[PDB]
Design an enzyme around this catalytic site. Structure first.
Site, PDB file in Angstrom:
ATOM      1  CG  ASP A 106      -2.063   1.045   1.308  1.00 46.65           C
ATOM      2  OD1 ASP A 106      -1.791   1.914   1.940  1.00 46.65           O
ATOM      3  OD2 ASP A 106      -3.001   0.852   0.400  1.00 46.65           O
ATOM      4  CE1 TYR A 154      -9.084   6.174  -0.040  1.00 47.01           C
ATOM      5  CE2 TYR A 154     -10.115   5.491  -1.814  1.00 47.01           C
ATOM      6  CZ  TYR A 154      -8.930   5.608  -1.110  1.00 47.01           C
ATOM      7  OH  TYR A 154      -7.974   4.908  -1.663  1.00 47.01           O
ATOM      8  CE1 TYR A 237      -4.924   7.766   1.070  1.00 51.87           C
ATOM      9  CE2 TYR A 237      -4.283   7.785   3.485  1.00 51.87           C
ATOM     10  CZ  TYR A 237      -4.886   7.124   2.316  1.00 51.87           C
ATOM     11  OH  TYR A 237      -5.285   5.634   2.407  1.00 51.87           O
ATOM     12  CG  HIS A 295      -6.125  -2.854   0.548  1.00 55.08           C
ATOM     13  ND1 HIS A 295      -5.454  -2.435  -0.495  1.00 55.08           N
ATOM     14  CD2 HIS A 295      -5.883  -2.284   1.670  1.00 55.08           C
ATOM     15  CE1 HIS A 295      -4.445  -1.469   0.155  1.00 55.08           C
ATOM     16  NE2 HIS A 295      -4.587  -1.471   1.319  1.00 55.08           N
TER      17      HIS A 295
END
Ligand SMILES: O=C(N[C@H]1C[C@@H]1c1ccccc1)N1CCC(Oc2ccccc2)CC1
Ligand SMILES: O=C(N[C@H]1C[C@@H]1c1ccccc1)N1CCC(Oc2ccccc2)CC1
Lengths: 316, 316
Positions: A106, A154, A237, A295
């Site tokens: 990830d 998101y 992010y 995931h």
């Protein structure tokens, strides 16, 4: 097959005055550094750590910056890829390792790809679970990639500091039970988050336990995120423009070290096909693919993960 | 070339509920565990750590039980050789190391000999600085031995709990400056300590700074011993009967692994001749010898220590 926290060697390295990285260490042999994703832990590698150690490797399973016992400074810029990469190189220097194998999942996968790209001398080889390497595009900025692909709504929700933090911290047990599920047990829809006003706006108040995880394992994550919360982790992010600018500096250069890309069939954000043209810039790339796997790759299919990583480490 | 503590990777392993061992870790390759003596620190290996790491080894420098950031339980029994060795075995286990080369100095040297005797399966090779291996004598008491050796008077002075602790802790800075000196800078006699009533009764109040050490190095030791003081370190001396008995269930076994004995010409407690018949019990024994070198072998002749250890490590 799994790790108990209090039975592990716990290591701490200061990478600059503000900042120390925590890791767990097991085994002897070549150094393999495991780098988790969002919102996870060193413990997300709990099924890999003993198997890799037993296969003849010295495993360093990180708490990535923002997480667990590693420092979690508040400033967004502390979590851009450039800073995070430099800190990891410093990590190796303080441990006196000239090189290590980096394996990421990830956000950790994005990290190890940049380590391979910019610090190939320190990366013996590189593997990624789920996250592909896409060379940066100098023409389209980061904001035009979300308009092209609604799935990342998101991510927009994660941008404003404070907002996503409060929802995710509000009830930690519910957060991790809602996230850590097999893909067929999903209770979330990363698609109209900003309009709905939250990730869990209409998912169950008391989610059931996924067949991937026990109550004890959920509580470990809960315990870990009480220390610094979700600000550090969500800051990963919030540097898309800074990451893009930096990625654009190494356009011409290609990854020439041994490389592994592992895809998971049912990961609905990091879809297998996103990786499909990685041959075009890594012709020697080796592949794995896991079926029926969502995931949360390490938790979902630990045995398949173990077999694929061990075979790849032992060959190239 | 030395170590800066804030630049080291610090490791921690809980070996039982009450006890965790701290270590510093540098380099890659075969594991080498360094075990200091009384009253020292992992830091006493500061000149060996980078040299061994640079020579291709993974160095684990211990804070032994009682010292620095390692636990220091109050009870005397916690520091008998049986408990200490067993703990070192648990240490390797949790780190996931099947074997390590053990290198010791002073009490640490006594430890690694016992490790080789009782746990040969975990010890790849063994080296001792100053401390000889003498098989236990079934017929002679531990207190009986000191009555044929007046230099060991100080050991009697160490027996009563609280007494020496108070003296050594009353001015830590004076303590280390008085102890850590070249043998020609000596300001202490270990002749008649008990009746003279203290180790420092006739030594200067503000001793000069030995040539072996800087003021900063001294202050590091000061800082370290403020945490737990001298009770734990001194408890290493208060188990002679138990250690003797324990050793008396090993008289048949020989050390078959590679072994290195390093003697120090001017160590006036651990005299070279004390080692002179070690090849009667260890025929393959390698030796090193350092001229003009007092008790504090690592700081006194770091170049020579490094040369010797590296050569022997590369050979057997
Ligand atoms: O958001 C995630 N992970 C989701 C599972 C986490 C999640 C999602 C929602 C809630 C909780 C947890 N990404 C997207 C950003 C980046 O992927 C990129 C970036 C750029 C290019 C290619 C790939 C890393 C992975
Ligand atoms: O006291 C020390 N070290 C002195 C230098 C420390 C010191 C002395 C005085 C003040 C400060 C520090 N020991 C006693 C235990 C063992 O000796 C034996 C015992 C039995 C057999 C063989 C060797 C190792 C050496």
């Amino acid at each position: 097959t799994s790790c108990n926290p209090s039975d592990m060697s716990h290591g701490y390295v200061t990478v600059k005055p503000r900042v120390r990285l925590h890791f767990v260490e097991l085994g002897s042999g070549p150094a393999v550094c495991l780098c988790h994703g969002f919102p996870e832990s060193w413990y997300s590698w709990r099924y890999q750590i003993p198997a890799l150690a037993q296969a003849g490797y010295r495993v360093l399973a990180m708490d990535m910056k923002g997480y667990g016992e590693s420092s979690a400074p508040p400033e967004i810029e502390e979590y851009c890829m450039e800073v995070l990469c430099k800190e990891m190189v410093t990590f190796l220097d303080k441990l006196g390792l000239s090189q290590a194998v980096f394996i990421g999942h990830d956000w950790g996968g994005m990290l190890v790809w940049y380590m391979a790209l910019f610090y190939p001398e320190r990366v013996r080889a590189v593997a990624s679970l789920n996250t592909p390497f896409i060379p940066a595009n100098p023409n389209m900025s980061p904001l035009e990639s979300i308009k092209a692909n609604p799935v990342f709504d998101y991510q927009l929700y994660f941008q404003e500091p404070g907002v996503a933090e409060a929802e995710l911290e509000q009830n930690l047990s519910r957060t991790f039970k809602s996230l850590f599920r097999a893909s067929d047990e999903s209770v979330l829809s990363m698609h109209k988050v900003c309009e709905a006003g939250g990730l869990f706006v209409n998912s169950p108040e008391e989610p059931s336990l996924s067949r991937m995880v026990t109550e004890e394992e959920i509580q470990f994550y809960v315990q870990q995120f009480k220390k610094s919360g979700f600000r550090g982790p969500l800051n990963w992010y919030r540097n898309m423009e800074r990451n893009w600018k930096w990625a654009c500096k190494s356009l011409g250069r290609k990854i020439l070290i041994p490389a592994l890309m592992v895809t998971a069939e049912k990961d609905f954000v990091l879809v297998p096909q996103m990786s499909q043209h990685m041959e075009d810039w890594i012709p020697h790339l080796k592949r794995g693919h896991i079926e029926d796997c969502g995931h949360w790759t390490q938790m979902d299919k630990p045995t398949e993960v173990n077999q694929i990583l061990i075979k790849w480490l032992d060959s190239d």
